[PDB]
Amino acid sequence: MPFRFSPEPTLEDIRRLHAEFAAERDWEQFHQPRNLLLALVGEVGELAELFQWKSDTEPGPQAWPPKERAALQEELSDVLIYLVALAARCHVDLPQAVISKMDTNRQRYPVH
Amino acid sequence: MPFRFSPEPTLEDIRRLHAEFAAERDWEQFHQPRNLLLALVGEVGELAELFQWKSDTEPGPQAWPPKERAALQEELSDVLIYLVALAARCHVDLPQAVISKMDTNRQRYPVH
Amino acid sequence: MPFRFSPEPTLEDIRRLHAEFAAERDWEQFHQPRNLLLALVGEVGELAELFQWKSDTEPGPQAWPPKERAALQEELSDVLIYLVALAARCHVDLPQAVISKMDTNRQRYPVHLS
Amino acid sequence: MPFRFSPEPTLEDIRRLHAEFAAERDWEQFHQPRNLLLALVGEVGELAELFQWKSDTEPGPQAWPPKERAALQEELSDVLIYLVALAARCHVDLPQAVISKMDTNRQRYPVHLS
Numbered sequence: 001m002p003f004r005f006s007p008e009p010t011l012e013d014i015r016r017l018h019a020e021f022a023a024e025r026d027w028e029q030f031h032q033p034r035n036l037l038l039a040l041v042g043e044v045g046e047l048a049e050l051f052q053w054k055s056d057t058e059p060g061p062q063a064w065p066p067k068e069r070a071a072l073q074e075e076l077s078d079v080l081i082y083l084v085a086l087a088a089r090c091h092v093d094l095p096q097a098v099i100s101k102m103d104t105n106r107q108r109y110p111v112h
Numbered sequence: 113m114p115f116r117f118s119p120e121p122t123l124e125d126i127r128r129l130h131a132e133f134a135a136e137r138d139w140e141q142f143h144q145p146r147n148l149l150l151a152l153v154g155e156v157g158e159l160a161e162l163f164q165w166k167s168d169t170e171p172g173p174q175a176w177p178p179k180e181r182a183a184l185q186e187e188l189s190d191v192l193i194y195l196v197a198l199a200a201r202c203h204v205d206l207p208q209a210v211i212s213k214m215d216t217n218r219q220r221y222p223v224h
Numbered sequence: 225m226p227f228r229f230s231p232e233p234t235l236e237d238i239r240r241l242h243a244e245f246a247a248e249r250d251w252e253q254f255h256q257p258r259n260l261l262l263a264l265v266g267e268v269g270e271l272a273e274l275f276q277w278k279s280d281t282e283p284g285p286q287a288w289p290p291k292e293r294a295a296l297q298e299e300l301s302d303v304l305i306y307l308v309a310l311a312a313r314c315h316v317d318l319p320q321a322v323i324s325k326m327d328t329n330r331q332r333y334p335v336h337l338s
Numbered sequence: 339m340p341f342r343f344s345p346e347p348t349l350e351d352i353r354r355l356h357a358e359f360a361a362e363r364d365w366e367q368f369h370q371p372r373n374l375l376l377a378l379v380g381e382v383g384e385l386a387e388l389f390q391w392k393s394d395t396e397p398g399p400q401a402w403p404p405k406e407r408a409a410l411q412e413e414l415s416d417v418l419i420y421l422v423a424l425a426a427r428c429h430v431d432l433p434q435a436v437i438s439k440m441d442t443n444r445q446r447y448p449v450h451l452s
């Protein structure tokens with residue numbers, strides 16, 4: 001069966017949800033660009049932890065046990081959340097930036 | 113004026129675009145979960161490079177010069193692209209995972 | 225007062241200590257280069273966590289409370305341990321690699337160019 | 339044949355060399371703890387780039403070509419240099435911190451528990 005993502009939330013949805021979440025807690029002050037970047041590095045660390053001891057031969061993440069799948073979902077999400085937060089705090093239009101980068105990626109690697 | 117992200121592309125759009133991009137180049141084989149994770153770490157490194165020498169007093173990323181804004185857009189995008197690729201390769205529904213994580217974030221930090 | 229590191233352990237000492245530690249536990253198999261690299265990334269993450277919510281204006285790490293200083297020591301050490309392990313597992317002579325890199329750094333940034 | 343690191347430079351030697359290097363260029367101001375941490379993350383990124391597209395099956399770093407080995411040496415060194423600089427800037431005695439962490443590691447993972 002095809003794997004797909006759910007159609008929502010969108011990146012804008014996530015931006016808004018996170019901005020609201022921060023604003024309700026008066027956390028704007030903690031969400032400066034370098035704080036968010038360091039938090040992002042922390043989350044990439046947590047994501048790496050999930051993979052660090054995995055052998056080549058053992059089951060891959062598509063087949064990980066329930067607890068490990070939950071962890072993987074959560075850390076992938078933490079990374080995305082801070083990345084969205086950081087892009088928003090820098091006034092970067094992340095969806096349109098990705099389109100531009102994908103276009104550049106196509107040029108740098110022609111199908112050839 | 114309000115800052116917002118463009119409404120598209122969505123995360124599914126990005127998943128599809130990237131999957132197509134990889135498939136046209138026969139790059140599936142290089143896109144194993146640990147490859148994608150290491151590539152993601154590389155991109156977070158590139159993003160860090162943009163910030164590493166910034167003083168506290170100098171202009172923040174909202175006011176960076178054109179070349180630096182372009183770089184910032186591009187690396188934020190590279191991070192997102194690999195994160196999407198990795199989540200997809202692990203069969204994680206990244207948008208719905210984020211909703212779940214945001215719900216958990218609300219519980220762990222009640223507005224209080 | 226001038227700050228300095230202790231004269232030992234050296235990087236070789238740390239290589240040996242870690243190799244001893246791994247070998248007693250039969251952990252060689254877990255210490256392939258990409259495992260060690262990913263573990264290193266994890267530790268850099270833990271180190272970053274300690275700094276992530278520090279403001280610009282507030283006191284630096286020299287003034288952090290005992291628990292935070294202990295954490296900082298521990299994560300800096302975890303990073304170094306894996307870095308040594310990884311360099312060893314790749315047969316890189318890490319101390320001499322640093323000499324070579326410092327020499328390269330001097331050339332890329334001559335004093336009279338800043 | 340048994341692999342070992344050179345006996346020097348030591349971590350103190352590297353601290354001094356980096357401090358000399360920075361001071362000649364008047365780079366102190368750029369070497370605040372969070373700058374050094376972010377620079378470290380950048381270098382871990384460069385190190386990861388070297389491994390990112392390596393397959394599971396293909397030869398390990400011991401067999402990489404001369405250019406890739408040089409890069410590996412250089413990035414491992416950049417990581418260590420910033421790590422030393424950061425530890426020094428935080429007044430952490432990095433060699434003794436590693437001793438303490440190794441002792442902690444032994445307790446958290448006793449041999450008879452694996």
Ligand SMILES: Cc1cn([C@H]2C[C@H](O)[C@@H](COP(=O)(O)O)O2)c(=O)nc1N
Nearest residue numbers: 022027030077078081082213214217220
């Ligand atoms: C503590 C804290 C959390 N989060 C959100 C973003 C992440 O998805 C999640 C991480 O929380 P923790 O660091 O407690 O795991 O909560 C956030 O935006 N800002 C914060 N100051």
Ligand SMILES: Cc1cn([C@H]2C[C@H](O)[C@@H](COP(=O)(O)O)O2)c(=O)nc1N
Nearest residue numbers: 101102105108134139142189190193194
């Ligand atoms: C070389 C390569 C690139 N990219 C894409 C994802 C990133 O957005 C961008 C990064 O390319 P580079 O590493 O050349 O900067 O291109 C990818 O998906 N897979 C690859 N094997």
Ligand SMILES: Cc1cn([C@H]2C[C@H](O)[C@@H](COP(=O)(O)O)O2)c(=O)nc1N
Nearest residue numbers: 246251254301302305306439440443446
């Ligand atoms: C679990 C494990 C630990 N360590 C050592 C290196 C670090 O200094 C510390 C990390 O332990 P933990 O991931 O449990 O915090 O212990 C190691 O070398 N190899 C392992 N397979």
Ligand SMILES: Cc1cn([C@H]2C[C@H](O)[C@@H](COP(=O)(O)O)O2)c(=O)nc1N
Nearest residue numbers: 325326329332360365368415416419420
């Ligand atoms: C630009 C710069 C360099 N280096 C040193 C530490 C690393 O070993 C190497 C990094 O140089 P580059 O970022 O240009 O590759 O040079 C440093 O200590 N401080 C700096 N402000």
Ligand SMILES: [Mg+2]
Nearest residue numbers: 043046075078
């Ligand atoms: Mg997390």
Ligand SMILES: [Mg+2]
Nearest residue numbers: 155158187190
């Ligand atoms: Mg990039």
Ligand SMILES: [Mg+2]
Nearest residue numbers: 267270299302
């Ligand atoms: Mg640790």
Ligand SMILES: [Mg+2]
Nearest residue numbers: 381384413416
């Ligand atoms: Mg480097």
